[PDB]
Amino acid sequence: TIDSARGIFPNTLAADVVPATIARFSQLNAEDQLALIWFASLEMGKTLTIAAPGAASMQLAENALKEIQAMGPLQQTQAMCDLANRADTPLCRTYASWSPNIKLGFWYRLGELMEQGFVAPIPAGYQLSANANAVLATIQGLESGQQITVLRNAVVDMGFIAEPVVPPQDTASRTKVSIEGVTNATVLNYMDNLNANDFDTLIELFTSDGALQPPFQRPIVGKENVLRFFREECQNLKLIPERGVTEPAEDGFTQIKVTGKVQTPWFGGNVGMNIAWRFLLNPEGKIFFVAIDLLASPKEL
Amino acid sequence: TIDSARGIFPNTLAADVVPATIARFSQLNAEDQLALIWFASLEMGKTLTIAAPGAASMQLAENALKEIQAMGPLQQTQAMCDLANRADTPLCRTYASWSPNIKLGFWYRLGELMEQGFVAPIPAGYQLSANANAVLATIQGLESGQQITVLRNAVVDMGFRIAEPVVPPQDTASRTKVSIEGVTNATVLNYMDNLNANDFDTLIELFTSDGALQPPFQRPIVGKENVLRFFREECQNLKLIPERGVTEPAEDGFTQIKVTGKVQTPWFGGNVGMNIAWRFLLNPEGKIFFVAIDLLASPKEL
Ligand SMILES: CC1=C(/C=C/C(C)=C/C=C/C(C)=C/C=C/C=C(C)/C=C/C=C(C)/C=C/C2=C(C)C(=O)CCC2(C)C)C(C)(C)CCC1
Numbered sequence: 136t137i138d139s140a141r142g143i144f145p146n147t148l149a150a151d152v153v154p155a156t157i158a159r160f161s162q163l164n165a166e167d168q169l170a171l172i173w174f175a176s177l178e179m180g181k182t183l184t185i186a187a188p189g190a191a192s193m194q195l196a197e198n199a200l201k202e203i204q205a206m207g208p209l210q211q212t213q214a215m216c217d218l219a220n221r222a223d224t225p226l227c228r229t230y231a232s233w234s235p236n237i238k239l240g241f242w243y244r245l246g247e248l249m250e251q252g253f254v255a256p257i258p259a260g261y262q263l264s265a266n267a268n269a270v271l272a273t274i275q276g277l278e279s280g281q282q283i284t285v286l287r288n289a290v291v292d293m294g295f296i297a298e299p300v301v302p303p304q305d306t307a308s309r310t311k312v313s314i315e316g317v318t319n320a321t322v323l324n325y326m327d328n329l330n331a332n333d334f335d336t337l338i339e340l341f342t343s344d345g346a347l348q349p350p351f352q353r354p355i356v357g358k359e360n361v362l363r364f365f366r367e368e369c370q371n372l373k374l375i376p377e378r379g380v381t382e383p384a385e386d387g388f389t390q391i392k393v394t395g396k397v398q399t400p401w402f403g404g405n406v407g408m409n410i411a412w413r414f415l416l417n418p419e420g421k422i423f424f425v426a427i428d429l430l431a432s433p434k435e436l
Numbered sequence: 437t438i439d440s441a442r443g444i445f446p447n448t449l450a451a452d453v454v455p456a457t458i459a460r461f462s463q464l465n466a467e468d469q470l471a472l473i474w475f476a477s478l479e480m481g482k483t484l485t486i487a488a489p490g491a492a493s494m495q496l497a498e499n500a501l502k503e504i505q506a507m508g509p510l511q512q513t514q515a516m517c518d519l520a521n522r523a524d525t526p527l528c529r530t531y532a533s534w535s536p537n538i539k540l541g542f543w544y545r546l547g548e549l550m551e552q553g554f555v556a557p558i559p560a561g562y563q564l565s566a567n568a569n570a571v572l573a574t575i576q577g578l579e580s581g582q583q584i585t586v587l588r589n590a591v592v593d594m595g596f597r598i599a600e601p602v603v604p605p606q607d608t609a610s611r612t613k614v615s616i617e618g619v620t621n622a623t624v625l626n627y628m629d630n631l632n633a634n635d636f637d638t639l640i641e642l643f644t645s646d647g648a649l650q651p652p653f654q655r656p657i658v659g660k661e662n663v664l665r666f667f668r669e670e671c672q673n674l675k676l677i678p679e680r681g682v683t684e685p686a687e688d689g690f691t692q693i694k695v696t697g698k699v700q701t702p703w704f705g706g707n708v709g710m711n712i713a714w715r716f717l718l719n720p721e722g723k724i725f726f727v728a729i730d731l732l733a734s735p736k737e738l
């Protein structure tokens with residue numbers, strides 16, 4: 136079973152504080168949510184700078200952005216609350232149709248306009264609720280890797296269409312990773328092809344019924360689904376695995392675990408996220424299941 | 437706005453450790469989830485015993501319970517994993533159609549059969565994962581009030597509208613009235629009294645047509661039709677025991693009232709007193725536009 140494979144290398148300690156904090160955040164009042172994120176990014180931006188959104192991304196979020204700017208300050212803040220409350224709204228429906236990167240670039244743009252004053256800002260001297268206060272304190276106590284994940288997910292969870300697929304990296308321009316302990320070809324091809332945005336080659340590593348499980352999400356099942364996931368969300372990452380361990384599995388399978396770091400194009404090398412990959416390969420070396428964990432600490436490798 | 441009303445009495449500290457812990461639980465392996473609940477249940481049972489499920493409830497879950505028993509051990513544990521993983525399954529679909537009380541009684545009965553051996557039990561000596569172990573430690577460090585809420589919610593979230601029969605409102609002469617230090621408000625007192633009497637028809641009349649009720653850690657349930665369905669499906673045989681409250685003016689001639697006290701669920705009777713806050717937003721005529729029910733972080737929140 137795919138669902139059973141979810142339990143390989145059960146010693147792996149994932150940072151479940153992330154979804155735990157996201158759950159707390161979700162309980163909050165809409166204006167409190169917006170205020171909290173404002174407060175958090177304002178303080179993170181002091182040391183971490185967000186990569187400017189892509190051109191195609193901006194073009195796609197341009198209509199919604201203009202519409203909000205045309206609104207009066209009241210309607211502006213009301214439309215932001217709608218996004219936050221996951222209200223049924225034309226704006227929220229369009230927002231929901233966006234890929235994570237477009238949603239992110241959408242809010243990236245609102246944040247500038249708010250600081251400039253052209254869009255209704257978080258009220259001045261605004262005070263967070265008792266609960267909201269605690270949630271922000273928890274966030275600020277987190278590793279940057281976990282901080283940005285918490286923010287990314289809170290944004291993706293709002294609302295009620297993706298970027299263009301960049302061409303695979305030129306073959307001669309590609310680099311190969313090395314993993315202490317792991318020479319397995321599937322694992323190595325996985326890493327290399329993903330770093331080269333070669334999703335077409337990547338997907339061929341999977342079994343037809345194979346699954347990929349992103350951090351704190353359910354397994355994405357089937358080649359069609361996994362490939363869409365690659366094309367919509369997994370562009371321009373930098374996988375930097377370090378060590379791995381190789382073990383036999385039931386029915387002639389092989390389970391491999393690799394730990395290392397990953398970089399998002401949104402923050403580049405300024406935020407190195409601690410990641411574990413858990414592979415379950417069939418006898419022919421096909422990926423039946425691969426899980427990506429955000430690790431609790433560097434103490435997880 | 438209903439969603440804006442969600443922010444009344446903002447300094448009220450709710451036990452968001454509950455949904456946080458539920459979020460951690462959900463990340464877990466299906467088998468680790470079942471084992472964890474088994475472990476927590478087995479330890480809680482030491483000092484807190486669960487009330488037996490209702491007869492009507494049992495009859496309603498009887499078919500599903502039978503089917504699972506007829507299965508071989510392997511298929512039994514697999515069906516249990518389906519529920520946990522929220523797999524798309526005829527069983528899960530039937531489970532999903534049930535009211536929380538029926539789901540709960542369903543599992544109540546499975547647990548007896550497992551302890552008796554008639555249904556495949558949690559593998560002996562089984563070891564929880566790193567993450568699963570932590571989640572159990574957090575649960576065991578919680579107040580019983582928050583422990584049972586965590587378990588209730590984990591169960592309700594399983595599967596992929598069948599409900600118990602509505603009990604008759606308590607005889608009018610037999611009804612008690614609550615008292616609340618500082619609060620003589622008629623709506624508030626009627627709310628408490630009618631609920632304790634299972635008189636939902638009278639109770640629902642206190643709401644504005646577009647009024648909402650927000651259960652702990654849930655979104656506002658909006659509209660008299662929806663709220664009343666909620667009353668009939670989930671809110672029978674509660675015991676509300678408010679203690680004090682504070683009354684304040686609100687925008688547009690409204691009035692916001694906050695009441696703190698305890699609540700008892702028929703599942704545990706007086707063995708678990710939950711710390712609860714009520715936050716009312718009443719319109720000029722005294723209709724409930726919004727009422728939120730919070731599980732409080734600590735007795736220090738009363
Ligand atoms: C909201 C809001 C505002 C704006 C907030 C902004 C602007 C926040 C921007 C946050 C961003 C920029 C977050 C970026 C997160 C990036 C992440 C978390 C990347 C993680 C990638 C991973 C870990 C991928 C791992 C993978 C691996 C390695 C595989 O092996 C397979 C594929 C895959 C699974 C993908 C303001 C302030 C105005 C206030 C009002 C409301």
Ligand SMILES: CC1=C(/C=C/C(C)=C/C=C/C(C)=C/C=C/C=C(C)/C=C/C=C(C)/C=C/C2=C(C)C(=O)CCC2(C)C)C(C)(C)CCC1
Nearest residue numbers: 473474477543544547584585587588651671699701703729
């Ligand atoms: C799973 C599982 C198993 C069985 C587990 C079982 C059997 C667990 C049973 C637990 C139960 C029985 C918990 C019950 C909790 C009930 C609660 C938490 C009630 C709280 C009610 C409140 C707070 C309502 C407040 C209200 C107020 C006062 C209002 O003003 C308006 C209405 C409302 C909002 C309703 C075993 C072990 C075999 C292992 C395998 C898997």
